[PDB]
């Protein structure tokens, strides 16, 4: 009977995020999903059991190489399935298991898309470490989660090799791809044009369009990632490597969770530079929440929400318990609402996913109709741009992010994308700018990380 086995430990957080680099350096394959700032864990994935890559049909799992033709994120549950474990209450939410992305063309498994838009950039469908043996750090706690996966005399000594690979003092750190054309200024204002035509005619309310930007990549992307961790916080943050691509993710927004039975969605309304003092966040936050524009598109996007965890909770359980409340952390703010479902029995991971990804705020209402024209206008595919991060437990929790803010490094670019919500009224050249200021913090991060290996 296979089951996680774990011991907690006192631990500081610059301690776990140190000792996590000087121990990745020497792995080809890992991953950090990292509470930056607001968050409860931190989650190290250092040495897989398994690696599983799905794209166009076909999934690998190296675990041995098994191999199948179809929706890769099925083929992967059919596997992963046969590890699955009872929640053990005392250890974290995570407690072992698929730690990777689903990639925006995952829902080319779950509608009917065209291959309008060019694949340049090869991304993985889905792309997943699967983990025995985690160290999940709890900020609240101020401890260091081992964990590892028996069947307690082989138990222990595996915890004791584990606890002494995080304690064990280890010395300070020390190809070019074709890529096809992102938009012009003039080609994303003309797709704007296209999308208040669609809008106009009845057949969408809202579009998130969005533009890709990429530059030649001159530093290690783990530094870009400190660089973006210190300026930008945000509680689903990611560093993904593998020897073919890295992932630099700062996203603030979950799409979903599981724990036990309860399905939850967070979207995010719109987010702002706190102020000095409580009167002035009261203030600046009262600003967005009182905007009636704004609040009837995030109420179209609640609604959708709803829809969307209703294909898979029990008729009449679909609840907003929170509506446009206020998420304050670092120098930023966000306006957040929680919708709730009760999972209905039968309804699987995957189920879920096909319920609710790609997330209706980085889409648009209605979904699947949106989805059609965002492939009919953008010149490239998303890849894992508004497809998700996050972790499929043994034990059937699952938790995931939606990749936004996030820097996709292959082929020697760093790439950059970013969107904006087209509404029927939307002005081309505005809507222009408020996608290419959504890129700062990633323009910026890519910056400084330059400068700072220029210093001698
Ligand atoms: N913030 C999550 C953990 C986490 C960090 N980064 C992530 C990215 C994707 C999913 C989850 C995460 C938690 O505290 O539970
Ligand atoms: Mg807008």
Not at 51 to 74: A, C, N, Q
Not at 95 to 109: K, P
Not at 296 to 323: K, P, Q, T
Not at 440 to 453: C, K, V, W
Request: proline share 4%; aromatic share 10%; hydrophobic share 35%.
């Amino acid at each position: 009977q296979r089951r996680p086995a774990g011991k907690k430990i006192p631990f500081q957080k610059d301690s776990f995020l140190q000792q996590f680099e000087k121990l990745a350096q020497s792995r080809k394959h890992h991953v950090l999903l990292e509470s930056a700032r607001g968050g409860r864990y931190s989650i190290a994935g250092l040495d897989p059991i398994a690696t599983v890559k799905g794209k166009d049909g076909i999934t690998t799992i190296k675990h041995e190489m098994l191999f199948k033709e179809g929706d890769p994120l099925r083929a992967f549950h059919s596997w992963f399935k046969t590890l699955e474990t009872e929640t053990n209450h005392e250890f974290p939410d995570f407690q072992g298991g698929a730690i990777g992305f689903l990639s925006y063309d995952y829902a080319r498994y779950i509608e009917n898309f065209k291959m309008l838009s060019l694949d340049d950039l090869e991304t993985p469908d889905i792309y997943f470490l699967v983990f025995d043996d985690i160290a999940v750090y709890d900020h609240q706690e101020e401890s260091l989660w081992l964990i590892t996966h028996v069947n307690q005399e082989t138990a222990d000594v595996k915890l004791s090799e584990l606890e002494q690979m995080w304690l064990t003092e280890l010395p300070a750190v020390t190809t070019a791809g074709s890529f096809a054309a992102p938009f012009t200024e003039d080609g994303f204002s003309q797709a704007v044009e296209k999308i208040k035509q669609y809008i106009a005619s009845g057949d969408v309310f809202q579009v998130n369009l969005s533009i890709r930007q990429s530059q030649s990549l001159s530093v290690h992307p783990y530094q870009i990632y400190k660089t973006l961790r210190e300026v930008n916080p945000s509680p689903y943050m990611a560093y993904l490597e593998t020897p073919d691509f890295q992932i630099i993710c700062g996203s603030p927004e979950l799409l979903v969770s599981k724990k036990g039975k309860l399905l939850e969605t967070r979207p995010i309304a719109g987010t702002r530079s706190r102020g000095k003092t409580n009167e002035e966040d009261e203030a600046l936050a009262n600003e967005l929440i009182h905007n009636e524009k704004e609040r009837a598109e995030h109420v179209m996007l609640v609604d959708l929400e709803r829809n969307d965890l209703g294909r898979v909770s029990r008729y009449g359980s679909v609840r907003v318990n929170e509506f446009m409340a206020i998420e304050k952390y670092s120098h930023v703010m966000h306006i957040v609402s929680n919708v709730q479902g009760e999972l209905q029995d039968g309804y699987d991971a995957v189920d879920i996913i096909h319920a609710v990804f790609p997330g209706g705020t980085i889409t648009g209402a209605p979904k699947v109709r949106t989805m059609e024209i965002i492939e009919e206008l953008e010149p490239t595919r998303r890849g894992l741009y508004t497809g998700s991060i996050g972790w499929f437990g043994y034990n059937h929790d699952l938790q995931f992010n939606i990749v936004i803010r996030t820097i996709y490094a292959t082929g020697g670019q760093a790439f950059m994308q970013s969107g904006a919500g087209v509404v029927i009224d939307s002005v081309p050249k505005h809507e222009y700018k408020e996608s290419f200021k959504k890129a700062f913090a990633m323009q910026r991060a890519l910056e400084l990380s330059e400068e700072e290996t220029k210093i001698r």
